Amino acid sequence: AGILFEDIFDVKDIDPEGKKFDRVSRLHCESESFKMDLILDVNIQIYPVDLGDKFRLVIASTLYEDGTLDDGEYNPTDDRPSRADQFEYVMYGKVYRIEGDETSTEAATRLSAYVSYGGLLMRLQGDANNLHGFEVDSRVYLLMKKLA
Template sequence: MKQEELFPPPLLFEDMFTISEIEKKFDKVSRIKAHSQIHQMSCCVDINTEIYPVSIGESYTIALSMTVEYTSNPDLTVEALASQAQPKGGQRYDPRIFNRTTLLDHYDYVMFGRVYGCSTEDQNAGDNAAVYISFGGLLMQLKGSTKALENIKYGIQVYFLMNRVRKDIA
């Protein structure tokens, strides 16, 4: 029997960020401030630095996704994924299901949370927006281009995926 080919799910957002500031908030948590290289975004996010230490000047890929599960549909879009009937609580990762590939296999640090706020600046100020996400009390603010943030809607559940960029490929 031929194994079905699987494809990664569409991402809501992805960019490469360089950390410019680290504020030690608690024993295990630091608030990092970073700026992106592709979409000219700014990110302020709380990270458990006890389990995932970070450094000023290092670059990281940060992505947001509604699911970490791979799909058999290579043409699945964010819009189609958002319109699918979701079970109460969204499309959560189930660690009891073994022997499968997920986005978790490709990232070093992952959090799961909910978008609790979205805002846009006055049209005269430019084309800027901000989204606010809570990951069980660890907070994130992502600011920048409205176009880059257009798929992130109020109330959706998202996975925050972070990966250190190796210097030999950056």
């Protein structure tokens, strides 16, 4: 279905150092059922978020849920393929590096993947089995919605 990662997160902190910018906040989130963590820059005038919130986070390579890669161009009239509309926050960025903790002999056991959403950054740390489908120079979507 083109999906790469899916989990439920829980906000821990909002601005550990201070309000640097006036329309963007730097969420610090911790995962459940996977024991990963997140660092996410999110616009806050449109999508307000505060402490103790839980949301569902999906990182998909395409919206058309059938494969059918994106073509990377903006067309507002194409409402046909019935994309993922069940979320409240959609973004579109690209992966710009992937780190690791491997030595000359063994393999990476805990990866770390970075993504840039047109200027808003994101990092995602976890064990190497979940950060599998990521690769540098690749477009991804970010999908979020709050839970009650």
